[PDB]
Nucleic acid binder design. Structure first.
Lengths: 129, 129
DNA sequence: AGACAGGAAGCACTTCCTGGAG
DNA sequence: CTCCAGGAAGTGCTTCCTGTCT
């Protein structure tokens, strides 16, 4: 059995650069970035899936903001501003706020027809219940 | 003498990403993009310094646009549009258009005191004139 | 107080287009 | 024609602020 296919490795399952390159959507966007962090085993301490579908929660809001800023060269980035970005998604039907729960948002389920992966397949690949 | 791990190889003398990080100017901008290609030995075939100060020339506009498009994930990018972005630099005083010379522009923001380099030195680190 | 909704203004283009000069 | 100038509209935030709830 020479032809070995040991899947991927230890890198974000859905990296932002590739997603954005694939869709030719322009420079990387906030939701694409959060998607990368979420499909990456290591990032799991400051951002994770709540287990309920596409609902995710920013366990440590500032760590996520710090990286968002470091990624776009916006040193003064933080959650108060990062979140304004999310609120604009409410109309564009991309992400919605999970009312009543601190730091909790949910992608619209149509992300599944774009990614090709099911929230459950993604949960499995990583490790969440 | 092992401490001879001191190179000056084939990587841009001024990467756009690092320049942006150094200034914390946000996503890579077009003028930073062209700066990187101009300070990269391997790109002297489609874009290069004309030898007069910071005057540069797009010897192959389409290749520059293509590359520009690939950096920001905008596959439909062409010179027609890249040059529109350049024109918006006139009122911002970042670039001046050499009149009577196809595809020739000049950086006019004070690049020397921001990069620390000199038109001459950069000309030296490269083989231009 | 911090989380959160959304108005307002600004930034750096990207995309479309009229129009003028060589 | 192609280059080139610049108007006008739109995107995806970034930055700032009022106001509400909790």
């Amino acid at each position: 059995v020479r032809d070995r296919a040991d899947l991927n490795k230890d890198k974000p399952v859905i990296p932002a650069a590739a997603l954005a390159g694939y869709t030719g959507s322009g420079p990387i966007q906030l939701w694409q970035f959060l998607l990368e962090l979420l499909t990456d085993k290591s990032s799991q301490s400051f951002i994770s899936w709540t287990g309920d579908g596409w609902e995710f929660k920013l366990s440590d809001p500032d760590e996520v903001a710090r990286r968002w800023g470091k990624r776009k060269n916006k040193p003064k980035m933080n959650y108060e501003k990062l979140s304004r970005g999310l609120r604009y998604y409410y109309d564009k039907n991309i992400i919605h706020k999970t009312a009543g729960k601190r730091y909790v948002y949910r992608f619209v389920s149509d992300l599944q027809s774009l990614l090709g992966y099911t929230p459950e397949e993604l949960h499995a690949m990583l490790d969440v219940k």
